[PDB]
Amino acid sequence: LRGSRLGAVSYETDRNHDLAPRQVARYRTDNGEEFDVPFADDAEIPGTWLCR
Amino acid sequence: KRLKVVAAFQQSGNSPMGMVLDAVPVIPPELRPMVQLDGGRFATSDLNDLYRRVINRNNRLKRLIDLGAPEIIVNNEKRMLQESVDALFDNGRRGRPVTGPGNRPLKSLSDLLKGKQGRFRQNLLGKRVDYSGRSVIVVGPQLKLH
Amino acid sequence: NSVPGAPNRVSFAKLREPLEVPGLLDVQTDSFEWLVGSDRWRQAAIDRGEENPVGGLEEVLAELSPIEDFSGSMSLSFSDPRFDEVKASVDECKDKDMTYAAPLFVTAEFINNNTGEIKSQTVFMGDFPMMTEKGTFIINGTERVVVSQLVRSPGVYFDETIDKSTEKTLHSVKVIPGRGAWLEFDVDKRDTVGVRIDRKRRQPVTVLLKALGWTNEQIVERFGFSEIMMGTLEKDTTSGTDEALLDIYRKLRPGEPPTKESAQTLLENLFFKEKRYDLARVGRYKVNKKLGLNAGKPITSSTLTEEDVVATIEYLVRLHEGQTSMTVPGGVEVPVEVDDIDHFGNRRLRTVGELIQNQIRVGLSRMERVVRERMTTQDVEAITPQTLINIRPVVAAIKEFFGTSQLSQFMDQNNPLSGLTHKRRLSALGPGGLSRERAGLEVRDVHPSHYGRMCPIETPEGPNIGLIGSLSVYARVNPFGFIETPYRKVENGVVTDQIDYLTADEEDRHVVAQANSPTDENGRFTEDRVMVRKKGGEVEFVSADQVDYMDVSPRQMVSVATAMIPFLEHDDANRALMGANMQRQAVPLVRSEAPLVGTGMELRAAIDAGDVVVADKTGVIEEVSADYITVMADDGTRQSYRLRKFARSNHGTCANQRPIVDAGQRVEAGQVIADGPCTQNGEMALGKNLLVAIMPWEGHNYEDAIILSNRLVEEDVLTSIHIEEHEIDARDTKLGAEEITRDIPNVSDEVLADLDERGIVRIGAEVRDGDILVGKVTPKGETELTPEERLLRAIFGEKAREVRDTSLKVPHGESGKVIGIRVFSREDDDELPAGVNELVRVYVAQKRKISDGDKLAGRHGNKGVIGKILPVEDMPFLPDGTPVDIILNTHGVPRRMNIGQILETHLGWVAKAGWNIDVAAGVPDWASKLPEELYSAPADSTVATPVFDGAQEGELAGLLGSTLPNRDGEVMVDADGKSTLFDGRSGEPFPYPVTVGYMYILKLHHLVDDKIHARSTGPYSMITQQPLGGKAQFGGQRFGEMECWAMQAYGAAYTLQELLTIKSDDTVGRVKVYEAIVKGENIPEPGIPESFKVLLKELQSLCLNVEVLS
Amino acid sequence: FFDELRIGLATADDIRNWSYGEVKKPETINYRTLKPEKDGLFCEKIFGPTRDWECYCGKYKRVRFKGIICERCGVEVTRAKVRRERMGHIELA
Amino acid sequence: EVINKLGRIQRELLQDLGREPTPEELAKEMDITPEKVLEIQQYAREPISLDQTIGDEGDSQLGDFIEDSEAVVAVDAV
Ligand SMILES: [Zn+2]
Helix, strand or coil: CEEECCCECCCCCCCCCCCCCEEEEEEECCCCCEEEEEEECCCCCCCCCCCC | CHHHHHHHHCCCCCCHHHHCCCEEEECCHHHCCCEEECCCCEEECHHHHHHHHHHHHHHHHHHHHHHCCCHHHHHHHHHHHHHHHHHHHCCCCCCCCCECCCCCECCCCCHHHHCCCCCCCCCCCCEEECCEEECCCCCCCCCCCC | CCCCCCCCCEECCCCCCCCCCCCCCHHHHHHHHHHHCCHHHHHHHHHCCCCCCCCHHHHHHHHHCCEECCCCCEEEEEEEEEECCCCCCHHHHHHHCCCCEEEEEEEEEEEECCCCCEEEEEEEEEEEECCCCCCCEEECCEEEEECEEEEECCEEEEEEEEECCCCEEEEEEEEECCECCCEEEEECCCCCEEEEECCCCCECHHHHHHHCCCCHHHHHHHCCCCCHHHHHHHHCCCCCCCHHHHHHHHHHCCCCCCCHHHHHHHHHHCCCCCCCCECCCCHHHHHHHHHCCCCCCCCCCCCCCCHHHHHHHHHHHHHHHCCCEECCCCCCCEECCCCCCCCCCCEEEECHHHHHHHHHHHHHHHHHHHHHHHHHHCCCCCCCHHHHCCCHHHHHHHHHHHHHCCCEEECCCCCHHHHHHHHCEEECCCCCCCCCCCCCCCCCCCCHHHCCCECCCCCCCCCCCCCEEEECCCCEECCCCCEEEEEEEEECCEEEEEEEEECHHHHHCCCEECCCCCECCCCEECCCEEEEECCCCCEEEEEHHHCCEEECCHHHHCCCCHHHCCCHHHECHHHHHHHHHHHCCECCECCCCCCCEECCHHHHHHHHHCCCEECCCCEEEEEECCCEEEEEECCCCEEEEECCCCCECCCCEECCCEECCCCCCEECCCCEEEECCCEECCEECCCEEEEEEECCCCCCCCCCCEEEECHHHHCCCCCEEEEEEEEEEEECECCECCEECCCCCCCCCCCCCCECCCCEECCCCEECCCCEEECEEEECCCCCCCHHHHHHHHHCCCCCCCEEECCEECCCCCCEEEEEEEEEEHHHCCCCCCCEEEEEEEEEEEEECCCCCCEEECCCCCEEEEEEEECHHHCCECCCCCECCEEECCCHHHHHCECHHHHHHHHHHHHHCCEECCCCCCCCHHHCCCCHHHHEECCCCCEECCCCCCCCHHHHHHHHHCECCCCCCCCCCCCCCEECCECCCCCCECCCCEEEEEEEEEEECCCCCCCCEEECCCCEECCCCCECCCCCCCCCEEECHHHHHHHHHHCCHHHHHHHHHHCCCCHHHHHHHHHHHHHCCCCCCCCCCHHHHHHHHHHHHCCEEEEEEC | CCCEEEEEECCHHHHHHHCCCECCECCCECCCCCCECCCECCCHHHHCCCECCCCCCCCCCCHHHCCCECCCCCCECCCHHHHHCCCEEEECC | CHHHHHHHHHHHHHHHHCCCCCHHHHHHHHCCCHHHHHHHHHHCCCCEECCCECCCCCCCEHHHHCEECCCCCHHHHC
């Protein structure tokens, strides 16, 4: 038998010396906890976010 | 005998909050894979069903409290939630086990590491290895000892 | 006289056979014909004196009818099943992948009491599989066999136990029905009596006895003689004829409301009414003879009565009392004894017919269950048998039995002997029987009752030893399912010509003499005392006049395979078992030769096997060809026999048949006209007879290894043909349909040079491993090519097609020539699976020669792998120049206790070179017992040595001394069976003479080709991320805990870590190590195996705070 | 480096710290597209993408977006192997 | 609801004709194409569990013999 994980796997080399700029936005929840989310420089940051 | 447990809980670095669960963790999906066999036949694991049982009831209770139903139905919902969590952790430890299609108890989180199979007995202390082979042997008298 | 055209094989037999070997496939055909109520079966049953015999189907239909609606207003009945004709022939079913079956028709009748109008007509019941002429079934094209299952016979069996605390003996009785709830009566740990029903709470017998209507006075009157029964009665305190029923209700089934009527009905609801409890007509018979009840008259009611319970209680009481016999008013006197569980007076075999009957009964029970609702759902005017009868459940059950039951197994088709022994197998396993995990050591032990019924030698050597047996040669099955065996009646001390078939219990009543005992021409015993077996299964000397029966032949106790081992007496049973098992693994060779020294069974074994073709009518051959044979019978009819050529058996062997007749030859009915795979002139030929010298040779035959001459490779002496089947299916996917096309992406134009115009490999082309057999492509979907791949595409003039290559290819290590292709297409109305558009099957045939590592074996349990194949000029050779073919080591014979191979070698040498005993001054002393025809023989003269009536040692020595010379008029082997050999390498003669002769060896199916496998890297399991196992597609070897212990003992810390992390489940480490090896860099150290990460995640998910501290 | 292994007792805070997102629905995958359903089991927003360096909405499909969390569906551009390392939690009423 | 209706019609037709129906018959009865009938049948297909035993023995499990089609073949990756 053979199957699939409903996905795909590749082998492109991972790099960290050249990465996109991140403008992290921090969201505060009603319960008082705060969570940070890194978004690209394109902005369009949503006013509300579903946290962890 | 009671002092044994009391001292175990005394200055042991852990609080007694652990025996009451305010939330339960979910195992990563790839450890409970949903895969499509060759020919379109899907395959899953029982852990998914046992998890859904916990979610569904947990949702229904949230409705019953929202609707302000009398305490009988809310109490029944809480009891079923308790039973569902118990089945998720150790299916069959209390009452009859929950069974899936056919007739077989659903494997729980405790059943995949306690029984004859499971990590502690199986998939540990032995496994298959690459760069290996096997074949029939015959006598060679022209060889040296090495 | 045996077979019309049997070859003349002189026999050393000294005892004349009073009875011939019966048909070896009868155990299947007779049972199946009983099931379907064949006319010849009915005639045979009438010949025995049966009043109105009834078949299995008729019996089940009669027990089902009449179905009623619990109101008495209407009834449904079934009767007279019938079969019209078979849908298709055997070969057509086999090649079209369809079941060999016939339609079943039964006449149904419907009655309405309120009006009297009755409607009767034939109803279709379904396609029922039919037994072929050879005792097999064809299911979905494949050939299956159903084995008989040994089971505890229903009845009452008494047992004795000892309480250890008091060390006191006590007795109990258990009753087991065909269907129902079990019950037992028991004696307590100290002078008390108890009873249990349906495993429920233990209760005294007095309560049950009172609940059945026996008042205190009646109980005292009947059981006043006993001591413990009266003691318990005084100890007992329950009272009342009806109140006892409530007591039983609360003891067995407490809690539920004990209404008086419910308790009154419950006791008879599952014991005394056939609706829920039944002995299946065999338990009834067993109880009738055990207790002597209803002697001489059958009982239509197979269920329990009230008389039998009290009879069993009386039997148990008298057994506990120490009585030797007991009697019941109205019956007959019977002895009082304990019953042993393993005695064939208690075990019975249910054949294929009874298993199919049980499955049909379950299906019909489901059918009537549905009909019960359908009665109420319908109304009087619209209800009719066609609408009222639903055949789906019975058809489904029948389809389930053959395709799922453990008893129904793939036929073993290595050679005719293997298939013949498969059909005669006796299995203790299967549903309703024992289990390998629950099988104790006691049930596997040999028992005296097996003599003449189940062979003690032939049994698997694996964990299934003793659980799987083999039916004896002369054994036959009684209608009740008990194995009978024939014995010669002895009257007034002289053996009679009358033969009686006796069961084990019937045999125990008498003392049986052995056929080997000597008798005069008039049948009177010549000796004063006779060797006999007694009731207890013990051997003794008994007076001549005290014997009642004598064995039919010395072969009575052995099976078909065990009877094919010559000199069986000189081989220990342990090695005889090995020889019998290995005779069933011989592969069919390209050319077959019958054994030079045989036993005489090989003839009847082959003809009954079913792989040979025998003429059905006396006549003259019209024309002969490699494909078909035409016979012109005397009466004016013409017969045509079609021979299957190069057909593939279930185990991948060749099934080629060839004619042995020529045009213008007159043949007789039953004469063999075409040989099967492992036969020569109608005689079973599993191997080859070759020249063997017994000596150690330079250590190349060390530890059971074998040395072969290169001649056996040059002349294809041990060459075989193996045919493999490869299958590929084209079935549509969500992204589009996959199709078989000649053109496929990213392949050279030379790869598809051997593919037909429609993309299938051409017949006759040689194919290696990895070669394309069937080109196929599948839709791929999104491309998302990496930029480097797009650039490379731009460099060349190629573009990415939307299809993946998934063509069929030859597995690794496989090769040969394509000999056949079969194609099924949905476009041509073929019975393809759901979603499958096309199916292609390709057959590849390869000719395998004998090579190093192949396994050879004799008939005496002597086996070994070929370690060296020497050139002809290197082998030791006889003084006349003949080189020996095989060399066997001396050291292996003496300890293994299989000296029969030495006798076989001597007699084979005697047979190859003819012999002539001088009779100048009368017959020599050692030749007094030899028959006349054995006083001379030419070269290559085949001889027969019956298994227990074969050649004696003195005769063999004399024949060795009286062998004919060679062409040069000089003897090569002296009277000791030895000869002076010359060394092929140095040329000097060996200092001492060596034993030389001819031995028969078999080529086993443990060839190297299908066992060697290796793996550097390959597929990985998706769940456990470890290399997957199996022989196919680069499986990996397992490193168990014992190997880990050995590594730890060596102190090899690094090798163990490498084996457990790098090579098994270190996902990153595997690729990194492969990269390092290919590039030629230092191996990186391993990380964390996936197993430990999964363990940590499981622990965390189980609410455990497992953490790692540095 | 490994020195010792400790097995404590897990509280609600520990489970919430391990959790990457709460499971709200019993959904596993779409019956028609077979993609994982959001906010439920197999959710890619919580347990990670099913395809290496891709995104559920497909906007991001290159390694350069490594570490970026899509603002349209909330998936993080990371290798699909991470789906066997990410854990969720269920809040009980 | 569509699946339930298809099942009920299939049971009715099977009971009326006794033998199994055909995709053409279902298409004719339900006023949908046979391919749509096959699609509904596929949508009604329930999955199985990897935890089921396999190999005619109780030790092995079904998931033991499933290849990882997405595994990173080393020779390519290098
Ligand atoms: Zn997105």
